[PDB]
Design a protein around this ligand. Structure first.
Ligand SMILES: Nc1ncnc2c1ncn2[C@@H]1O[C@H](COP(=O)(O)OP(=O)(O)NP(=O)(O)O)[C@@H](O)[C@H]1O
Ligand SMILES: [Zn+2]
Ligand SMILES: [Zn+2]
Lengths: 200, 335, 204, 336
């Protein structure tokens, strides 16, 4: 009774995902090159736009559900391409101002809101992560829920891109840094410390 | 009445004729340095009242050492600073670098000069007659001097003597235990490491003197030339005065307490027994006879004696026949 | 023999957030030589510390200050400052480190630390001025605890220098630096100095 | 009755006598460089089929620019590389730095030299007589050269000319629109920005030549010295040839189509009308007379003419009296 997009972008771990208005999906000029990736490209993409099934047909390959996979799988590669878009950014960035994405673990980043990202644009070769515009390094997602989202679906360059477009939105460097202290003062180069992997 | 008094043969009144300040550290004030002046590096050793690392005075990059006094009373902390200061500049008397504190924890931190102290596993594993004699002499030098200033160590032991064998330099440490000797004054007998404690301590005789340092010393030499670390190896505190007796004999012991009518906690009563006074020739295995000399023995036997008044003193030990060869080469004793 | 209700420690070291805490065998607590200086901190020092060693109550007395519970606090409160002092101890470390070999403490958030197990720590040795954190022997920086549970444990109860100290004692145990680092890539390659990027806070 | 075929009065057969390779890019192969060779910096603008950033060749830290050709046909992409290569090393003909691709996306990326553009919209207002003459000359240099190689730009406009005023350096851009001039070849008239299109394009005459680049240029100059960006400001595609007519006149126009018997979409029929050919002295407000010279005018009037065969050409424009003063110093080249 309500859109597929708003449904999938409302499940666990899909908090990072932004609803990709079809203005961009219908414009098949974008879906380009995808067909030679996801299986059952069509049947799937229909399911995604909310068209009509193909219902009395057989089910040896259990197609009736194997497509469900393609639907979600595919909607990923699109969502990635999308968030790139000068507009898809506004959507993402909308979720950032309220970090539906999460904050930076480092304590000196002072609860810095981060944006999703992918270590690799290949499915299964990595999952989503979390670039921090402050520390400028990545961290694995907090809660165990956002743990099965493929990084590929968010684009290795999305974050970096976002600031190319919105340089003003690039945070300031940490006010202060973590200062290690024992009984009263700093610990000079522990270079030696390391040196003991020979006798360990 | 009960236990019999005793006193000090030499330097008997140093502190007496010295100012209230020199001895009353309880009312002593510290001139702290700056924490930031030096930063830590690598950990050296642990204590019970402190932890020791190797740091560096950033103001010059000079390898320094840092003891960090763990929370105690303002007492045991001050009676280690004042002492340390009066002695510093002394011969072999470890120089007191400086005092700082954790700006926040308000935690205390001592600083001394650095010393490439060769660990003992090496030391009492490759020393020769002279070496010992030599070193044993340098130690006395310290004791004599601190005794000169009217101060006793109460914690002499291999653990507390830094030895730079390469640089034949040697310094004493841990002045936390040392205190001042005042006539007729009772002190705490829960001092010194077990294996290095004196009889007065093993029999709650609370009015001892510098002579205490001597015992603990004798112990060191034994373990050394004989090669038995330590030579008086007991389990509890009572089994110490027990091992000790299985060597100097039981007799001279009882005669001791008698000479001083002391309350001998009846516990010993069934732990000591009856023992002859072994002739040191009993600890001369093939592997140590080259450290074992007659003057050696002799010298020793003149420290390891129950009565604290009978032990040789600084100056005295220093003039014994064991040392001759050593002090001779002291072309100008005092210069 | 059969009943192992263990002390109060095995109890308190089994609650939410107290996963980082290691049970402080009493050999060290009985030796009052350690508890030194504490009494001038925690309130009702005694009454508390008894509750901690499992002695006996003071049961019919009044409760205006609701002491019957006000002590409960001091109990936990105090056991903290002890646990702190403890974990420093050459032995307390082996316990902590026991929990590290199985990271009851948690791992490093950074992705390039490759699930590196961390040890708790405190940004301040003062109660309430901060909470526990998580030093990482690899990245060598600190991170705020993962789950919301370990979010009400005072950093002071773990010691600002505990971790640093631990490696002074066990330098062998200090991990190697990250094999690789995070390489930012857009459409195909690296992003030279965005020094400029920042420059836009004057018009933002 | 079938439209009158013309020919590129000059360079009319360059491509002809040139190799199959030179013009058949469809069968052209690319020698890619290394993506890693340089990394990004600022984003120098978006697009629809290509996005431009400012990067840097890590192999020396030299400010480079990077166009990222968005998915199109292997065509329009190749007919911009091949073109670009044959021209590079040309006078004011933007040097083609290199070609790379996203190792995974297989995405294309162009690379050119860097240029400190003081965007026309903010620079032009501050140019003096010489500046223009000067620059207008450097441009021709380009056109001449590309025409030399038998190539037309079809998209000349302020938007496409990088000007490093500080460095008096100037380069032309956007070779996506440029094509090859072959005798009697019909091309698409849906090229160039509206305001800069030529009459052959506004009257569906599909057999034009390099002369097209000239019109679009004439436009530029007008807007410039007169200070009207653009000078031919129309709404739709038909209101362009209308404004144009409200200046060169209606007559010469009709006479044009006649000279070429061309199917004039009867739409114009009621949109043009009857117009005298304004004397340029009509666009000389007090605020521009200092750029307005007689040779200036004269020179212009010799480009802005309906017949594409009547427009001055590269070399020709280049020998006009407007340029003399400039042409001199240029010769004072090496000679100084
Ligand atoms: N070599 C260069 N040096 C400096 N800036 C450049 C260079 N090449 C391109 N640019 C910039 O990129 C624009 C060209 O992008 P292009 O691929 O032609 O886009 P377009 O959107 O179709 N053009 P436009 O009307 O300019 O927005 C120019 O107008 C410049 O601002
Ligand atoms: Zn961060
Ligand atoms: Zn780390």
């Amino acid at each position: 009774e309500v859109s597929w997009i708003s449904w999938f972008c409302g499940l666990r771990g899909n908090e990072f995902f932004c609803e990709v208005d079809e203005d961009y999906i219908q414009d098949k000029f974008n879906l380009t090159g995808l067909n030679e990736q996801v299986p059952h490209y069509r049947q799937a993409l229909d399911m995604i736009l909310d068209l009509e099934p193909d219902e009395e047909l057989e089910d040896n390959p259990n197609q009736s559900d194997l497509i469900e996979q393609a639907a979600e799988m595919l909607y990923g590669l699109i969502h990635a391409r999308y968030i790139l878009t000068n507009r898809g950014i506004a959507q993402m960035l909308e979720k950032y101002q309220q970090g539906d994405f999460g904050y930076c673990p480092r304590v000196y980043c002072e609860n810095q809101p981060m944006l999703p990202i992918g270590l690799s644009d290949i499915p299964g070769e990595a999952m989503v992560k979390l670039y921090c515009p402050k520390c400028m390094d990545v961290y694995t997602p907090k809660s165990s829920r956002h743990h099965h989202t493929d990084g590929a679906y968010f684009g290795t360059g999305f974050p970096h891109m976002l600031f190319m477009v919105h340089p003003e939105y690039r945070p300031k460097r940490p006010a202060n840094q973590f200062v290690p202290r024992l009984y009263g003062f700093k610990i000079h180069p522990m270079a030696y410390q390391l040196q003991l992997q020979a006798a360990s | 009445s009960g236990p019999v008094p005793s006193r000090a043969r030499v330097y008997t009144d140093v502190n007496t004729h010295r100012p209230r300040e020199y001895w009353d550290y309880e009312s002593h004030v510290v001139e702290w340095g700056n924490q930031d002046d030096y930063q830590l590096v690598r950990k050296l050793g642990r204590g019970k009242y402190s932890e020791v690392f190797e740091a560096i005075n950033i103001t010059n990059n000079e390898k320094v050492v840092v003891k960090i006094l763990k929370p105690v009373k303002k007492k045991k902390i001050k009676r280690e600073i004042k002492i340390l200061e009066n002695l510093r500049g002394g011969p072999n008397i470890i120089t007191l670098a400086d005092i700082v504190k954790d700006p926040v924890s308000r935690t205390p931190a001592l600083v001394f000069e650095h010393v490439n102290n060769t660990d003992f596993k090496q030391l009492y594993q490759t020393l020769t007659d002279y070496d010992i004699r030599f070193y044993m002499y340098e130690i006395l030098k310290a004791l004599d001097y601190c005794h000169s200033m009217g101060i006793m160590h109460r914690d002499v032991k291999p653990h507390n003597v830094m030895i730079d064998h390469e640089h034949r330099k040697l310094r004493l440490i841990d002045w936390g235990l040392a205190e001042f000797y005042h006539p007729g004054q009772e002190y705490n007998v829960r001092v010194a490491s077990r294996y290095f404690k004196g009889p007065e301590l093993l029999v709650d005789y609370q009015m001892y003197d510098y002579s205490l340092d001597m015992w603990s010393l004798g112990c060191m030499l034994a373990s050394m030339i004989f090669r038995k670390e330590p030579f008086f190896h007991g389990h509890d505190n009572y089994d110490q005065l027990v091992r000790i007796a299985k060597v100097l004999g039981t007799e001279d012991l009882y005669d001791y307490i008698d000479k001083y009518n002391i309350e001998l906690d009846p516990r010993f009563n069934d732990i000591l027994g009856r023992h002859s006074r072994k002739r040191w020739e009993r600890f001369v295995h093939s592997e140590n006879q080259h450290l074992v000399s007659p003057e050696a023995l002799d010298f020793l036997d003149k420290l390891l004696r129950y009565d604290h008044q009978s032990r040789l003193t600084a100056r005295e030990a220093m003039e014994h026949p064991y040392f001759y060869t050593v002090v001779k080469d002291q072309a100008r004793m005092g210069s």
